[PDB]
Design a protein around this ligand. Structure first.
Ligand SMILES: Nc1ncnc2c1ncn2[C@@H]1O[C@H](COP(=O)(O)OP(=O)(O)OP(=O)(O)O)[C@@H](O)[C@H]1O
Ligand SMILES: [Mn+2]
Ligand SMILES: [Mn+2]
Ligand SMILES: [Mn+2]
Length: 340
């Protein structure tokens, strides 16, 4: 998905195959996903509404009776969190429903995002106190969010980018943080909002400890430093840090409205650190020239994290021109850490 967008989309049923023994269900490929459907629901080529994992579907027995015994109470409301599943060891991800359940979507084309009209939201794990700040204002409209699309949703784009080169980085499991300068203002943001400085806010504390506000003034440009804050009290602290710290993965050029290329970003990190502004960067793996299937890419996702004895959330791929990127999440990670 793209943040809170594209949780529910119109998609085309792919290859459908029988499931061993179970006479009432079958396996349906939907883009790079596989999920269990009931017999009678689809033939290959049919449209359906595909709800991606992490969708939260509020209880509705008329529309979603197949979820009635999967409901939890989440943020004060009964509904179902879609999660990675297995049936006799076979991977199933997401929910694929045929169009007869959605007569009001009959004019929607393949590719349409129907998240809002269906009221689908994204499930999120609990956030610790110091990662929720005093809201200064909106996330700046002149800075891109840090959302990354999943490789499973990019099958044609993977072929379109055959032969292109990518920076491969470890996907750290923390919270997205943006520190930016635009003319006479420097701000600190979390995932969704710009935050006021307080003595206990974790994003501001990380920005202050690494001097990245003075670093932005030194660079004297309109830039957004975007990174992951990880460590104690954040997302289970996979890396076993003491304390917290910021790990850069992108720099947004505000005036040009584009990301710096990986090489441009490496040079700015070097300039920052060489001048006393200690900014760390997410782990960088070998570059990849793309000549791969989604399946091969997903088989790259598991591996050592920043802490090499823990298994990483996955990988992010950023094309060397800065203009195309995606994430490959480790399915083993999704099945191991079921509470986030
Ligand atoms: N190396 C990296 N490159 C880019 N993003 C990264 C990297 N490491 C961690 N991240 C985080 O991964 C996110 C992109 O993945 P995605 O869009 O799936 O969000 P997410 O991790 O599910 O969101 P959240 O955990 O905030 O709910 C970024 O918003 C950023 O917080
Ligand atoms: Mn995600
Ligand atoms: Mn999330
Ligand atoms: Mn995350």
């Amino acid at each position: 998905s793209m943040g809170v967008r594209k949780l529910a989309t119109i998609r085309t049923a792919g290859e459908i195959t029988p499931i061993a023994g179970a006479e009432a269900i079958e396996c349906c490929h939907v883009d790079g996903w596989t999920c269990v459907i009931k017999k009678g629901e689809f033939k290959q080529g049919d449209r359906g509404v595909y709800f991606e994992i992490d969708s939260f579907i509020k209880e509705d027995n008329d529309r979603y009776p197949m979820l009635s015994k999967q409901v939890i109470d989440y943020e004060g409301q009964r509904g179902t969190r879609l999660r990675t599943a297995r049936l006799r060891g076979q991977l199933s991800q997401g929910l694929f429903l045929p169009m007869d359940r959605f007569p009001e979507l009959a004019s929607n084309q393949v590719g349409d995002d129907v998240t809002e009209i269906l009221g689908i939201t994204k499930w999120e794990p609990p956030i610790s106190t110091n990662l929720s700040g005093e809201i200064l204002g909106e996330f700046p409209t002149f800075i891109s969010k840090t959302d990354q699309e999943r490789v499973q949703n990019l099958i044609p784009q993977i072929e379109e980018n055959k032969g292109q080169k990518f920076e491969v980085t470890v996907k750290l499991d923390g919270s997205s943080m943006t520190v930016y300068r635009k003319d006479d203002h420097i701000g600190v943001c979390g995932r969704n909002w710009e935050l006021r400085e307080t003595a206990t806010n974790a994003q501001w504390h990380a920005a202050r400890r690494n001097k990245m506000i003075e670093g932005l003034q030194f660079l004297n440009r309109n830039l957004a430093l975007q990174g992951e804050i990880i460590g104690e009290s954040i997302q289970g602290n996979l890396e076993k840090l003491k304390g917290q710290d910021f790990y850069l993965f992108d720099i947004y050029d505000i005036d040009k409205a584009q990301y710096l290329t990986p090489i441009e970003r490496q040079s700015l990190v070097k300039q920052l650190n060489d001048n006393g502004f200690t900014v760390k960067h997410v782990p960088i793996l070998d570059d990849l020239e793309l000549n791969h299937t989604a399946e091969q890419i997903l088989a790259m996702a598991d591996g050592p994290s920043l802490n090499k004895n823990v298994k990483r959330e996955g990988l992010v791929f950023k094309r060397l021109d800065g203009k195309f990127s995606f994430a490959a999440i480790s399915n083993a990670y999704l099945e191991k850490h079921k509470d986030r």
